[PDB]
Write an enzyme that holds these catalytic residues in place. Sequence first.
Site, PDB file in Angstrom:
ATOM      1  N   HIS A  75      -0.005   4.008   2.472  1.00 31.54           N
ATOM      2  CA  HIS A  75      -0.305   2.923   1.543  1.00 31.54           C
ATOM      3  C   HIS A  75      -0.129   1.572   2.235  1.00 31.54           C
ATOM      4  CE1 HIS A  75      -0.963   5.143  -2.111  1.00 31.54           C
ATOM      5  NE2 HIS A  75       0.226   5.754  -2.061  1.00 31.54           N
TER       6      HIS A  75
ATOM      7  N   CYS B   3      -4.440   2.621   2.544  1.00 31.59           N
ATOM      8  CA  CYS B   3      -4.867   2.792   1.176  1.00 31.59           C
ATOM      9  C   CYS B   3      -4.536   1.476   0.439  1.00 31.59           C
ATOM     10  CB  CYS B   3      -4.176   3.996   0.547  1.00 31.59           C
ATOM     11  SG  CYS B   3      -4.873   4.473  -1.050  1.00 31.59           S
TER      12      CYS B   3
END
Lengths: 365, 355
Positions: B79, B128
Site C-alpha cells: 500500500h 496500491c
Amino acid sequence: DQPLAKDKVALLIGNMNYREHPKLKAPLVDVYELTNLLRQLDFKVVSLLDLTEYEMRNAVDEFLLLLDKGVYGLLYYAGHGYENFGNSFMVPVDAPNPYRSENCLCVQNILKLMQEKETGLNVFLLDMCRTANIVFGYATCQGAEAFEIQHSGLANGIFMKFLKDRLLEDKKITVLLDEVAEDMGKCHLTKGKQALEIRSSLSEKRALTDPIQGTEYSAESLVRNLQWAKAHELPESMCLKFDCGVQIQLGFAAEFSNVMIIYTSIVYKPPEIIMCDAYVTDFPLDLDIDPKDANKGTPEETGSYLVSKDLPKHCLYTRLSSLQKLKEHLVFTVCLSYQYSGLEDTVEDKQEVNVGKPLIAKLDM
Amino acid sequence: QPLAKDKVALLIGNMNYREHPKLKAPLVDVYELTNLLRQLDFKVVSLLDLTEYEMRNAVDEFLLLLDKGVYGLLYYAGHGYENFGNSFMVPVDAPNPYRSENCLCVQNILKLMQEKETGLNVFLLDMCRVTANIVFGYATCQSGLANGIFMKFLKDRLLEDKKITVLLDEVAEDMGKCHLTKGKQALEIRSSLSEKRALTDPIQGTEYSAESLVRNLQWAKAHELPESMCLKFDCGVQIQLGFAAEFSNVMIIYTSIVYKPPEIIMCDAYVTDFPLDLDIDPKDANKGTPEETGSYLVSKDLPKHCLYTRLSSLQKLKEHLVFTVCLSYQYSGLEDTVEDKQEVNVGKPLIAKLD
Ligand SMILES: CO[C@@H](C)c1c(NC(=O)Nc2cnc(C(=O)N3CCCC3)c(Cl)c2)cnc2cc(Cl)nn12
Ligand SMILES: CO[C@@H](C)c1c(NC(=O)Nc2cnc(C(=O)N3CCCC3)c(Cl)c2)cnc2cc(Cl)nn12
Ligand SMILES: [Mg+2]
Ligand SMILES: [Mg+2]
C-alpha cells in the site's frame, strides 16, 4: 498504425528583463529558434518575451484551454526559476527581491492541470536559471557569476544548444530527451554547469514529428486556429501620401508574438524636393518607447537581431516590444522634414496612423 | 564499457496489513524479482510484511551500502499513500486511518539517495493508491499466484542488455496495451541518468577492500540457513530435518522418517512448540505439500514426501529458534502409541541474525 495529433499547439515564454533580479540573454535566442523548429514540425506557436506575473498566468491558462482530446501541446519556459521545499516556480520579470512563491508560477500546479487533460502528448520543458501523456523536462543551470566573461550574446543556452540538434528527429520524445541528457553528459565543458531531469508518464510511441490527423474543419479545430491567427495579425504595409507629393512606405514585421518592428522608407520624392526625412514618433505611453532607440539605420541598433535578415534594407527601424501592455489602439505619428531645391527653409508635415491592436495586443483578455 | 563497483538490492513486499486490505501480488513479485536480480549478479535482501520500525531499519541499512560506483536497486510493493504531492510507503502495522508519521517518506529516500555517488540507483515503487544517477519508477496499479501488472511487464524485459531508462520506457509502452491498465497513467519514470548505465553492466574486477568486505559480510550474515539435521530417537527411528529460504525473513522447515526399525509398525514425526514471537498456528504446520503452508514459490526446489512448516516473520525472533520434533510410534502387535520428543536449537536464522 502511425500515431497522430489532433492538433499541435505551443507556448514559449522567455524572461530576460528582470526588474529586481539579474538580467538574462539566452531566452531571446532560445525562444526564437525553438519557435522556428516547432513551426517546421507544424506547431502553431505563441512566443512571448519578458512577461509579468499577471501576463504569464493569462498566457498559461489560455494555452491549457487549447489542450483538447488528442492535441499535442508543448509549454517552454526560459528564465529565472527557484525551488522551495521540492516545488519549482517560474519567476516573472516584475518579481520582488527576494522571491515569494505567491508572485511566481507554480510548476506542479501546471502539471496537475495538464494531468486533467486527454492530450495525445503534453511536453513541458523548463529551462531555468538557478492519460494525459505528460513528458516533463527540468533543466537547471547556474546563473553567470559577476566577474565571468559574457560570451557571444547571441549564443544559445546549454539546453537549447543540445535540444535544437535533436528536436527534428522522428523519434519518441522520451527517447529523444534521454539522448539530449546523454549528449550533455558527454560534454565535459557543460558537465558541471547544466542538469536535466526528465519525468514521464508517456505510455505510447508519441513523437513531435507525428502527423496531424486529416483535415477535420470542426468548430473545436476552428477555435484553436482562430485564437492563434487572432494573435498573429500584423498591420498591412501602408503607403502614406503627403500633400507635397512625398510617399512613405510603412512596413511591419513580427519578431515574437509581443514584439513588432516598424520600418519606413521614402518610396516617392517629387523632383522639386531635394532633402527628405521620415521618422516615427508619439507612440502610446504604455509601450514605453525611448525615442533615442527609435528610427535607427539598422535593426541591430533597436535591439532587433533575429528578424534583421528578413527585413528590407535602407529603412529606418523602430522596435515595439511589450505589445501586451497596449490597452488602446496603436496610434503614432509619421513625421516628414523636407526642403525644396534652392530654398533654405525646411518644411514640416505629419500624419497620424492607427494600426489597431497588433499581434498579442488584439487579445482583449 | 560501464561498470558497477558492486550490485546491491532491497526488495520489500507488504501484504498482510493488520488494519488495511490484504494484498496478494507482493509475494510473487518480490520472489521473481529476487531471482532475476540474482541472475544479474545482485546481492539481494527480500523481505515480506514489515512494520514501520522494520522498514526504516532495512532502508537505512540499504543506503549505507551505497558507496561510490555501487549499483543499487530499491523495490517496494504494497500500500501507498499520497498527501500534498508527497508519496509514502505504508507499513503492515499502519493504523486506520493512517498518517504520514507512521509511513516511509519516498521523497526523503530520494533526497538521501541524491547525496550518494552511486553508479546507478534504481528506486521502483509498485504501490496500491559526483552525481547519483537515480532512476525512479512510480507505478500505481497494485488470480492469487499471479504477478502484479508492473512486474508482469518488467520481468520479461529486465534481463535485456539495455540502458535502464530506455528499458523502463519500453515497459511503460508495453503496459499501455494491457486491458486492465489500458489508457491509464499507471507508470511514471523520473530520471537524472546522464550515462549509458544498465542493470546488466559487469561488476569491476572483484577487489578485496574493507568497503567491499563490509557489503558482502552484511549480506552473508543475513542469509545463513541451519544445516540439515539427522535426529536419532532412542527407539531407533531417524528423522531428517531440512531448512530452505523462501525470503530473507521466511524459512521452510521439512521433516521425513529416514529410518524406521522393523519392530516399529507405524510412526509420525511433527514439529511443535515454536517461539511465541513467530506466532505459528499449528493448524498451518506439518502439511503434506508446501502450497498448503502458503509457500508455493520455493515448492519446486523442496524434497517431496515430507511434512512442511512455513516460518515467516523471522525478524520478530528476539531469542534463539528453539522448537520440538515430536514422535508418535507403535510397536508390532501392541495397541499402545509410544511418544517421544527432542528439542532443537537452530540459532537466529536468516535476517534474525541481525538483532
Ligand atoms: C494567441 O492564442 C492564444 C489562445 C494562445 C495563448 N494565449 C495567450 O498567450 N494569451 C494571452 C492572453 N493575455 C495576455 C495579456 O496579459 N494581455 C494583456 C492585454 C493583451 C494580452 C497574454 Cl501576454 C497572453 C498561449 N499559448 C497559445 C499557443 C497557441 Cl497555438 N495559441 N495560444
Ligand atoms: C546491511 O545489511 C544487509 C543485511 C542489507 C540490508 N539490511 C537490512 O535489511 N537490515 C535490517 C535490519 N533490521 C531489521 C529488523 O528490524 N530486525 C528486527 C530484529 C532482527 C532484524 C530488518 Cl527487518 C532489516 C538491506 N538491504 C540490503 C541489501 C543487501 Cl545486498 N544487503 N542489505
Ligand atoms: Mg496436509
Ligand atoms: Mg508447485
